[PDB]
Design an enzyme around this catalytic site. Structure first.
Site, PDB file in Angstrom:
ATOM      1  N   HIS A 187       0.724  -1.171   0.097  1.00 31.38           N
ATOM      2  CA  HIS A 187       0.051  -0.142   0.018  1.00 31.38           C
ATOM      3  C   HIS A 187       0.804   1.075  -0.150  1.00 31.38           C
ATOM      4  CE1 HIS A 187      -3.928  -2.195   1.073  1.00 31.38           C
ATOM      5  NE2 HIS A 187      -3.140  -3.059   1.131  1.00 31.38           N
ATOM      6  N   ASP A 236      -6.844   3.962   3.926  1.00 32.76           N
ATOM      7  CA  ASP A 236      -7.235   2.654   4.120  1.00 32.76           C
ATOM      8  C   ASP A 236      -7.926   2.304   5.262  1.00 32.76           C
ATOM      9  OD1 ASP A 236      -4.109   1.567   2.532  1.00 32.76           O
ATOM     10  OD2 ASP A 236      -6.292   1.967   1.380  1.00 32.76           O
ATOM     11  N   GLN A 262      12.669  -5.050  -7.198  1.00 37.31           N
ATOM     12  CA  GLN A 262      11.747  -5.773  -8.024  1.00 37.31           C
ATOM     13  C   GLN A 262      11.334  -5.225  -9.342  1.00 37.31           C
ATOM     14  OE1 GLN A 262       8.693  -8.742  -7.042  1.00 37.31           O
ATOM     15  NE2 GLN A 262       7.077  -7.290  -7.748  1.00 37.31           N
ATOM     16  N   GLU A 305       3.623  -4.154 -12.477  1.00 38.90           N
ATOM     17  CA  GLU A 305       4.952  -4.285 -12.620  1.00 38.90           C
ATOM     18  C   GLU A 305       5.176  -5.302 -13.798  1.00 38.90           C
ATOM     19  OE1 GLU A 305       6.519  -4.595  -8.884  1.00 38.90           O
ATOM     20  OE2 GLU A 305       5.707  -2.457  -8.247  1.00 38.90           O
ATOM     21  N   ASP A 308      -7.833 -10.546  -3.084  1.00 34.88           N
ATOM     22  CA  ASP A 308      -7.336  -9.708  -4.221  1.00 34.88           C
ATOM     23  C   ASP A 308      -6.266 -10.692  -5.422  1.00 34.88           C
ATOM     24  OD1 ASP A 308      -7.449  -7.361  -5.797  1.00 34.88           O
ATOM     25  OD2 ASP A 308      -5.411  -7.111  -5.406  1.00 34.88           O
TER      26      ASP A 308
HETATM   27  O1  LIG Z   1      11.632  -7.908  -2.594  1.00 34.48           O
HETATM   28  C1  LIG Z   1      10.680  -7.295  -2.759  1.00 34.48           C
HETATM   29  C2  LIG Z   1       9.163  -7.746  -2.552  1.00 34.48           C
HETATM   30  C3  LIG Z   1       8.257  -6.827  -2.883  1.00 34.48           C
HETATM   31  N1  LIG Z   1       8.440  -5.522  -3.622  1.00 34.48           N
HETATM   32  C4  LIG Z   1       7.831  -4.757  -3.941  1.00 34.48           C
HETATM   33  O2  LIG Z   1       6.268  -4.633  -3.071  1.00 34.48           O
HETATM   34  C5  LIG Z   1       5.047  -4.439  -3.753  1.00 34.48           C
HETATM   35  C6  LIG Z   1       4.500  -5.754  -3.264  1.00 34.48           C
HETATM   36  O3  LIG Z   1       3.013  -5.228  -3.705  1.00 34.48           O
HETATM   37  P1  LIG Z   1       2.078  -6.356  -4.246  1.00 34.48           P
HETATM   38  O4  LIG Z   1       0.513  -5.793  -4.433  1.00 34.48           O
HETATM   39  O5  LIG Z   1       2.542  -7.050  -5.360  1.00 34.48           O
HETATM   40  O6  LIG Z   1       1.941  -7.503  -3.136  1.00 34.48           O
HETATM   41  P2  LIG Z   1       1.740  -7.577  -1.615  1.00 34.48           P
HETATM   42  O7  LIG Z   1       3.090  -7.312  -1.145  1.00 34.48           O
HETATM   43  O8  LIG Z   1       0.865  -6.796  -1.207  1.00 34.48           O
HETATM   44  O9  LIG Z   1       1.443  -9.134  -1.280  1.00 34.48           O
HETATM   45  C7  LIG Z   1       5.518  -4.342  -5.308  1.00 34.48           C
HETATM   46  O10 LIG Z   1       5.342  -3.002  -5.491  1.00 34.48           O
HETATM   47  C8  LIG Z   1       6.711  -5.033  -5.377  1.00 34.48           C
HETATM   48  O11 LIG Z   1       7.571  -4.380  -6.426  1.00 34.48           O
HETATM   49  C9  LIG Z   1       9.856  -5.291  -3.715  1.00 34.48           C
HETATM   50  O12 LIG Z   1       9.983  -4.150  -4.369  1.00 34.48           O
HETATM   51  N2  LIG Z   1      10.749  -6.024  -3.527  1.00 34.48           N
END
Ligand SMILES: O=c1ccn([C@@H]2O[C@H](COP(=O)(O)OP(=O)(O)O)[C@@H](O)[C@H]2O)c(=O)[nH]1
Length: 454
Positions: A15, A112, A331, A354, A371
Site C-alpha cells: 500500500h 485505508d 523488484q 509491474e 485480491d
Molecule cells: O523483495 C521485494 C518484494 C516486493 N517488492 C515490491 O513490493 C510490492 C508488493 O505489492 P503487491 O501488491 O505485489 O503484493 P503484496 O506485498 O501486497 O502481497 C510491489 O511493488 C513489489 O515490487 C519489492 O520491491 N521487493
C-alpha cells in the site's frame, strides 16, 4: 488551484509503494502531499520521493498492542496471522492522526481501513477519500451491499458465484470460496470482523477511489458507484515511478550473465511464507524447466534460513543457474532487466502492474487472498495475459509438474498458448503505456477531486 492532500495508507509495502507512486504524480501537477508513514519505515521510502519540496513525510509512532512484535511497523515485520494486531495498532494512531489533521489542515485525506477517520474529518471540514490500490473487481465481489446484508448467512457456495449485478463472469475453486467465506468473519483490528470494517469504510467515506483505468477497471467502478451512491473515482493505473537508487550491482552483474529473455523470476511479495511442501514443489518445478531462475522467497513455515529448507541436493544440481534469496530486492528494476523472460507472481496488484508494463511472460501463482485470486482470474481468463498454475480444487496445492508445465508453455516460442498470452500482454502493455492514457486518467481524477472539495 493546487490541492493539499494527506496520504494515510495501511502499514504494508504493497500500500505504501503505490500511494507514493501516486503522490509523485500529483506533486508533478503541483499538489502538496502530506504523507503519514510509520516512523522507522520512512527511511526506506525516501528513495521514492521525487518531489521533496511538495511531498513531506510525517512519522507515526506505531503503538504497542498485546501480541505485536516489539517495534513492528508494517506487515513486513510480522507474520501474516498477526495482521489483525497490526490493524489494532493502526486504529490506535487516532490521537496523533487527529493532531496532524488539525495542524496541517489538508483539503482531502486518502486512507485505508480506518473507518473512524471520516467522523474526524467532517468535524474538521476535510473530505475523506477511501483510496484502494487493489482491484475494484475484488471489492465488487466480496464487499458490495448484496454480500453484506447476508451477514453470517454468507456461505462458501454463496461465494462461488458473483453478487447480484456483478459485471463479469468467472469461477472460483471450492477452496478459494471457502477462504473468502471464513476470512470475511475473522476479526481484523479492535474486534471488528474484516468485512464489517471495510463495509464501514465504504459506507462512511465521502468518496471512493481505485487504482485503474476505464478500459480494465471501468465496469467494476460503474457497478460500485451504482451500489454505493457516491463518487467512485479512478486514479489511472499508477505506473511505477523511477527510484533514485540504481539496481544493486550484485544483481545487475549476475543477471547480465544470462541470454536475453532466458531467466525465470519468481517472487511472492513482501509478506507471506510458503509451507515447506509447496516451497519444495515450487523450487523443484523451476528446476525441471532447465531455465536459469531467481526465486525471491521467505523460508517456509517453521524454517529460519533458505539453506535449511532446500530440497536435498538442490543447490548442488542447480549450481550457478539458479538462486533462491530471502531478502528485499528491487523488484521493479529486476523485471525491467532484459534477461527476464518469465515472471511467476503471487498476483498482488502492484506486482501485476509491474509485470504488465514489462516484456516478461506471466505465470500466475495466486496465493490465498481475495485480491490475488480475483487478479489471477481476470489476468488468466479475461485479459488472458498469463497462464495460471493448476491447484487442487479442494486442497489448494500445486505439484512441481504444474509449475514446470506453466513455465514451459509460456517460454516455448512455438507453443500457441504461449504466443497468445504474449500477444495479449503486448496489447495490454501498449494500452497501459499509451502516451495519453495515464495523463488523461489523472486529468479526470484531479477534476473530480476539485469537485469534491468544492
Ligand atoms: O523483495 C521485494 C518484494 C516486493 N517488492 C515490491 O513490493 C510490492 C508488493 O505489492 P503487491 O501488491 O505485489 O503484493 P503484496 O506485498 O501486497 O502481497 C510491489 O511493488 C513489489 O515490487 C519489492 O520491491 N521487493
Amino acid at each position: 488551484s493546487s490541492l493539499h492532500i494527506a496520504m494515510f495508507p495501511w502499514f504494508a509495502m504493497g500500500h505504501l509503494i503505490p500511494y507514493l507512486h501516486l503522490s509523485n504524480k500529483l506533486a508533478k501537477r503541483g499538489h502538496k502531499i502530506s504523507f503519514f508513514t510509520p516512523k522507522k519505515t520512512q527511511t526506506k521510502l525516501e528513495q521514492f520521493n521525487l518531489y521533496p519540496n511538495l511531498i513531506t513525510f510525517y512519522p507515526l509512532n506505531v503503538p504497542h498492542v498485546d501480541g505485536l512484535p516489539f517495534g513492528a511497523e508494517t506487515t513486513s515485520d510480522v507474520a501474516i496471522s498477526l495482521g489483525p494486531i497490526l490493524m489494532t495498532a493502526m486504529d490506535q494512531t487516532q490521537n496523533q492522526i487527529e493532531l496532524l489533521l488539525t495542524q496541517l489542515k489538508p483539503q482531502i485525506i486518502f486512507f485505508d481501513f480506518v473507518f473512524w477517520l471520516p467522523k474526524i474529518t467532517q468535524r474538521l471540514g476535510i473530505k475523506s477519500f477511501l483510496y484502494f490500490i487493489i482491484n475494484p473487481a475484488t471489492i465488487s465481489y466480496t464487499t458490495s451491499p448484496p454480500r453484506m446484508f447476508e451477514a453470517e448467512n454468507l456461505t462458501e457456495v454463496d461465494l462461488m458465484k458473483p453478487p447480484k449485478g456483478y459485471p463479469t463472469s468467472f469461477n472460483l475453486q471450492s477452496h478459494e470460496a471457502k477462504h473468502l467465506a471464513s476470512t470475511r468473519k475473522i476479526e481484523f483490528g479492535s474486534g471488528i470482523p474484516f468485512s464489517v470494517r471495510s463495509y464501514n469504510c465504504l459506507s462512511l467515506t465521502d468518496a471512493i477511489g481505485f487504482k485503474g483505468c476505464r478500459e480494465i477497471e471501468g465496469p467494476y467502478v460503474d457497478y460500485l458507484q451504482e451500489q454505493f451512491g457516491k463518487p467512485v473515482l479512478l486514479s489511472g493505473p499508477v505506473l511505477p515511478e523511477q527510484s533514485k537508487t540504481a539496481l544493486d550491482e550484485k544483481w545487475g552483474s549476475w543477471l547480465g550473465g544470462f541470454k536475453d529473455g532466458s531467466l525465470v523470476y519468481c517472487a511472492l511479495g513482501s509478506e507471506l511464507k510458503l509451507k515447506q511442501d509447496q516451497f519444495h514443489e515450487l523450487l523443484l518445478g523451476l528446476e525441471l524447466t532447465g531455465f536459469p531462475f531467481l526465486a525471491i522467497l521467505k523460508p517456509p513455515v517453521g524454517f529460519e534460513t533458505i539453506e535449511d529448507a532446500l530440497p536435498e541436493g538442490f543447490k548442488e544440481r542447480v549450481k550457478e543457474k539458479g538462486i533462491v534469496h530471502s531478502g528485499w530486492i528491487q523488484q521493479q528494476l529486476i523485471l525491467e532487466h532484459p534477461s527476464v523472460g518469465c515472471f511467476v507472481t503471487h498476483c498482488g496488484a502492484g506486482s501485476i502492474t509491474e509485470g504488465l508494463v514489462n516484456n516478461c511472460q506471466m505465470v500466475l501463482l495466486p496465493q490465498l487472498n481475495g485480491d490475488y485470486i480475483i487478479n489471477a482470474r481476470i489476468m488468466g481468463r479475461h485479459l488472458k495475459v498469463g497462464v495460471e498454475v493448476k491447484k487442487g480444487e479442494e486442497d489448494g496445492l500445486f505439484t512441481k509438474e504444474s509449475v514446470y508445465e506453466a513455465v514451459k508453455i509460456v517460454m516455448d516460442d512455438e507453443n500457441e498458448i504461449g504466443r497468445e498470452v504474449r500477444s495479449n500482454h503486448t496489447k495490454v502493455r501498449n494500452l497501459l503505456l499509451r502516451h495519453d492514457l495515464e495523463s488523461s486518467c489523472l486529468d479526470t481524477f484531479c477534476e473530480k477531486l476539485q469537485e469534491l472539495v468544492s
